[PDB]
Symmetry: C2
Subunit: 295 residues, 2 copies
Amino acid sequence: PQVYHVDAFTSQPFRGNSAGVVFPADNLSEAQMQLIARELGHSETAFLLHSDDSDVRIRYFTPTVEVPICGHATVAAHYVRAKVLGLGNCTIWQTSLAGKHRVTIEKHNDDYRISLEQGTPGFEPPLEGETRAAIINALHLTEDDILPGLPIQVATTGHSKVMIPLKPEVDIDALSPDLNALTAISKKIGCNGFFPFQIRPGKNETDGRMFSPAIGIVEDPVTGNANGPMGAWLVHHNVLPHDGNVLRVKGHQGRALGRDGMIEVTVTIRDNQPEKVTISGTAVILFHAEWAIEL
Amino acid sequence: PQVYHVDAFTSQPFRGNSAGVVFPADNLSEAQMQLIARELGHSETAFLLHSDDSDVRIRYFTPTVEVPICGHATVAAHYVRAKVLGLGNCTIWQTSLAGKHRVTIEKHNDDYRISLEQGTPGFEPPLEGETRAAIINALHLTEDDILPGLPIQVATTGHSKVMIPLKPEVDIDALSPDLNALTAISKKIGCNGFFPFQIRPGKNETDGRMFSPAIGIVEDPVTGNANGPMGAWLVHHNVLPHDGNVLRVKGHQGRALGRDGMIEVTVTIRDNQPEKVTISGTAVILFHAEWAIEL
């Protein structure tokens, strides 16, 4: 029984999004898992369990509550598991609270990249009138800062987020929103995260920040559930040119926090609509240890 | 270069006040120590360094800033150091930004107790009028709940706290303070922490809670710089009987957080006043490891 401290969506130590990984977590109760996640203090800790109906079952806990699948924690978990079991190029099936998920492992020069297929892409009607203006004013921007001819709009591949497309000229790192205003807007529109992003001039690459004060996370460093839908939204609205039937976007997040990370978003396209979204990233293990106490 | 994860002021895993301990830290810069402290996410991480004017130097970092000294981190550090070096019953001097402090290490039953001698006890003029009323109201109490004829006041042995003496009848675990009100009080009085405490009937034994929302810590599990001054306060205001040489109080803190800890406070007495305050506790190492990355 070991604990691993992992920075996900980065190969640079102390960057990315940190997660704990514990295994084997078989015969740990729900309450012991919750206690260990509280103790480690990461946004999430993944606990790896044996499964007879899948390759592996993962349970995910914040310091206070069990959650369903989490992108960065899932990357961390499979990165650890690949490294410990010495996997090569493999497809793995994992179970969680949220059912079954397809995970891919790619090995290149003794390092690993983990891919996760997300749920079905979807969009809600664009936010207009007072709700739009209130979101823009919560970021202390004006309508001139928004990418022309594109909506502020809830997008999802499983956990919904508000897309806020910004012009390249906007200083996204200087953004300091009204957190209480965003929290109020989240209850009305029923969406707990806001995702302002911009596109690097000329490239299929982006820079975003994810603010979710309603749920108690002021800002998450690197968010698969924002970057995935963003890639889907980019196809849906024909914002980026693509050859073939795939859009590949390199999403950057976490720079203002001093926790830069990179998610590769691959979107398969059917009749110019997003069909499937896959997110990819690597990780770095800072340290790992056997527990010095009986659990 | 190793990292230890320690719960201080307890022998029970997952209780007490957790701290990180890193050593040797001699080839780390200030920036690296700060990043490590941020990464571990403990309220404090202690870094153990060679000293040229004492037995050991310690630097203390929260996730955001360097601090002069802290009790639970000091206990963690010397506990780890005692385990790693196989020390016996030793009295040593440590150096920090707070200066030179005397640390005692005691070995009983293959385990260790660490004592730290704090600074000189100090007591400011009692808080009265609107300020006293504001503090009581922010705890959702009334004047009937405060230990009769005793002041609410800033007291200190190194880092000041507001002493709030409650009747033993008050349900201290049920307190849920107006944190915005405490934050505004802290700014007016120039003190960031509030320490409601009560005395167990017939015993030299206390229960307390330390709230410090002004600095982004809603509640601290076990605070040496609150329990120390509390011990001194009890002598200064003639609250508990004693022989006249020493008063020993067993302080408890952290129960409502599910992070129960204990801190022994020893106060030497001269002319019916507190002269010298020592705090003591044990600790438990949850795990430790060499860093897997180059620092």
